[PDB]
Ligand binder design. Sequence first.
Ligand SMILES: O=C(Cc1nc(N2CCOCC2)cc(=O)[nH]1)Nc1ccccc1
Length: 836
Amino acid sequence: MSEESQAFQRQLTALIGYDVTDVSNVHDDELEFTRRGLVTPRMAEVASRDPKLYAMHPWVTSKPLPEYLWKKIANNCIFIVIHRSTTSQTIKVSPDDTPGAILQSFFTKMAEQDFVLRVCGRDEYLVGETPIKNFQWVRHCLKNGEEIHVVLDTPPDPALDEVRKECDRKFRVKIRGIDIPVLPRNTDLTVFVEANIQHGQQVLCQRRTSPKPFTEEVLWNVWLEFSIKIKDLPKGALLNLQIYCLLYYVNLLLIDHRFLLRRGEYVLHMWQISGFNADKLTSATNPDKENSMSISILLDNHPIARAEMPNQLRKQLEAIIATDPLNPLTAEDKELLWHFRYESLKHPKAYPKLFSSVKWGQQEIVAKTYQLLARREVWDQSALDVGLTMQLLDCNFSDENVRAIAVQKLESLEDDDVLHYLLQLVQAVKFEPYHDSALARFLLKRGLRNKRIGHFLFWFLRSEIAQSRHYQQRFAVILEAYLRGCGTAMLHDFTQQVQVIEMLQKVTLDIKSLSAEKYDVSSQVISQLKQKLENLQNSQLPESFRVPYDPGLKAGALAIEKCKVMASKKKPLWLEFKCADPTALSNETIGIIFKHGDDLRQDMLILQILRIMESIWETESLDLCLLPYGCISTGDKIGMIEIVKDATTIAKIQQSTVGNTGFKDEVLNHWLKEKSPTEEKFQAAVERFVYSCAGYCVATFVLGIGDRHNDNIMITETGNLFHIDFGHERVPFVLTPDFLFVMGTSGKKTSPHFQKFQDICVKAYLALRHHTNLLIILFSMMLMTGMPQLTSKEDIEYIRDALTVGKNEEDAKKYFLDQIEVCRDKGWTVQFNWFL
Ligand SMILES: O=C(Cc1nc(N2CCOCC2)cc(=O)[nH]1)Nc1ccccc1
């Protein structure tokens, strides 16, 4: 259209990180169809949201207030400090009051009501017809022991969020030939092409070409006639073409987004495997048209146009539903689930095991399944089970409707719940066969309904866009169809944020280069760090930006003097920022780490599960003092990390008292007391230590990341312990004698805190077991979309053994107590070993 419209699209391109208008790496118009197909659901959400409520984004939870927070409010009183420049009073509030109602007990109490309640030093607001007990910031203050300092000011202008105006024949495939520029290697070996029909990873039919010597060009021109008929092709079928010696792979949809059968000449560029993951399921081809392996294929063959169970049989089926998500279905089991479709339907938790039993390569069977889906009585009115819903969104299911019934359950999730699972759901898009889908349209809508959900969504999409060449095609389209609806308010914010993170990443890679691999850190690289920051703080670094992992915090100027580089193998950047928000309570500068080398996506996923792991314990009234710091991956092996103030590494405390590489059990307790100003805060630090050393000890054990080096765990000056750097004899978890010495026990004995330690650990361990399916599915998704080439059995299976699936709570209690004992015997053996 207009020239200004070109600049708007040019503005979006830089914000996404990928050119959406690009049509060089595509053989069809699935991107453009999806791009225009998302215009309706975007405007159907933009023109549907409340302009005022969206501007203020009041983050609220609807879950009941837990028992470990009612103890602080053992008086039915809340002390709010309403700031107003040089004026601040303390109005006593009841734990069941309304933002509008508490204003009335202020204006009349002091002595015009067009003002707003806003957090001091943050962009968080307290408004809406919701009890003050339901605000997450209020509950945050009650957890750590803080006072809710609010400020009286004018509500943000809702006009700033202005969105700018807008056959029965058997299927066959002709494998013509392959082409590759460079091949030279060691000894010669044979090579062939394997064609497969995929629908949820399971192969419906397999054909194979004749083995030939691996040369820079091999031609077959042979038809591979599959046994499956053209009419028996299910919606979202994949033509999996793979070159074995496996070296190259590429996928192509047998049925397009238009329901039409794909036909014509196709030359695809295949991805290379490093000498399973979602990257093997992608529909997009390799943009590196030069160095990648080519493959020419031809297609020319539109479509899609009572009896109650006996006692012993139903008891056999009930056992199949009771089994874990990672339990294989026998040909005997596969038939039982299907034959009794109607009785199997009456169990929400049986759907994943039901649809896996469905043979999708049959016209009639598929047709009967849709008839089964038409009568979703129990499923629709059932209580929302998240882990169950997630199961129907993984790789195992590719049917558009089977995945659609899951998204329906996600609709009932509120904003707070979306924030917990946002990373995984955005990651779950990889398992989708098509670009436009119910799940994709869902995340878009929720991101447009909430500024906070949208903020993380932006960085969650942008993470995969920058580095994952497999799915960046899809994610970029989803991001564009969000930026066109988030409003100019956030569009400005993202431009500020993108400029900052890109400028500093360039500095990160420059400084990391100007030094060797060996740790040293000289005044040279320190002065070079100082020099580059001086040029940025000028007319380069924008006045103030929003912290990507903490949207409420608005960081601005740099504390250049407090910046340095760590004396480690991979050189990062310790950075501190001045809070541009002047209504703040302290001079506390915001700490940010820019690190290259480690894959932050993996660290990002672990932290998210930990954030979910807290809510699991929260529902059962348990606090485990988990401290999942902010972390968002922005590019390849490079991203952003939060700094926890007053936190020191347990290993460094050993370096501060004993030798540099050469361990005293007493050191830890001495460090806590000297940093403690009073005796009480020390007792609070000792108690907090138990909780945090109980939270991570359980969490890190389940996820299989328990065996960590001494430097990989850090502790605050207030006793809060937490693991760091989730890059990727043995010990279940880290619990060395120096940790025990603080609790009172030394060298296998018993103390009042160690009994409490075991009490909390057990009560936390079985509490997770009551969510077995939710944790397992997130674990399986984590490895497939975050980690590299995982084991399709061994790696996923680990968590089943760790959660002791099968045995009762009493055997489980004993099992976990046994795992502690394994750490009681080794002591320092493992930590001393950590060198190889
Ligand atoms: O690299 C680390 C160790 C580390 N620290 C992390 N942060 C430290 C601050 O608290 C949150 C976790 C995360 C992480 O993954 N690894 N620390 C560091 C690096 C450069 C300069 C100064 C300190």
